[PDB]
């Protein structure tokens, strides 16, 4: 097997800040999507990250993962900045997920701003070579050039942009609390993410 860092994905909670997706529902969906992928693929590790130790989504996911008896060597939560996992967290993760916007543009606050700021213009060049847009519930894997400061400092080799459902009425494709559709699309976003990650590993 390759090194563990090469088989580790760190991801943030998609859709639950700027996109205002309900945390209780999101946490159920995270744990179900994680359980589903770990049932299929060996030798991967998944790490849910959020910036604050008071994170409500981390607390919910921990509770639910314990109830569901998810294998805690293969999935766990971690407090940290997704762009500083090795340097500040002490945890090397080669692949990270981004909660993107549909046009795959930098900025916009949230984790998307942080990732593009850390990665620099290399990520915008590389992303434009892979895809021009995302639709909700889908993702795209982008190899991160070795010249990127994020690669040099944190060992990140790939970023997977993911577009989750949007519940925020001041953002594109707002679902107006259609959580039937919303829940399906967030399930799809996580499965798409995890499948892209597995396709990088194997
Ligand atoms: N540096 C970080 N490290 C780890 N987690 C973070 C970080 N920054 C935020 N989070 C967590 O990341 C999680 C997701 O929060 P969001 O980034 O709003 O994603 P969304 O899918 O709701 O909105 C996407 C839109 O916002 C974007 O700007 C795009 O431009 C889109 O327009 C939360 O748990 C955060 O606490």
Author numbering: 95 to 296
Question: Which statements did the authors publish about this structure?
Answer:
Subsequently, X-ray data from the O. sativa macrodomain was solved through molecular replacement with PHASER by using the Dictyostelium macrodomain structure as the search model. We were able to obtain the O. sativa macrodomain in a complex with ADP-ribose, further confirming that the canonical mode of interaction with ADP-ribose is also retained. Additionally, F113, which forms a binding pocket for the distal ribose unit, is absolutely conserved, and the two substrate-binding loops (loops 1 and 2) that flank the pyrophosphate of the ADP-ribose are also apparent. Moreover, several key amino acids within the ADP-ribose-binding pocket that coordinate ADP-ribose binding are conserved in this domain. Of note, the APL macrodomain in plants is fused to two other DNA repair domains, aprataxin and polynucleotide kinase domains, strongly implying that APL supports DNA repair in plants as well.
Through an in silico approach to identify new macrodomain-containing proteins in this organism, we identify a protein containing regions of similarity to aprataxin, APLF and PNKP that we call APL (aprataxin/APLF-and-PNKP-like protein). Interestingly, the N- and C-termini of the APL macrodomain align with the C- and N-termini of human macrodomains, respectively, indicating it has undergone a circular permutation during evolution. In order to assess whether these permuted macrodomains retain important structural characteristics, we solved the X-ray crystal structures of the isolated permutated macrodomains found in Dictyostelium APL and O. sativa Q10MW4. Structural analysis of this novel macrodomain indicates it has retained the core features of this domain family, including the α-β-α sandwich fold consisting of a six-stranded β-sheet flanked by α-helices.
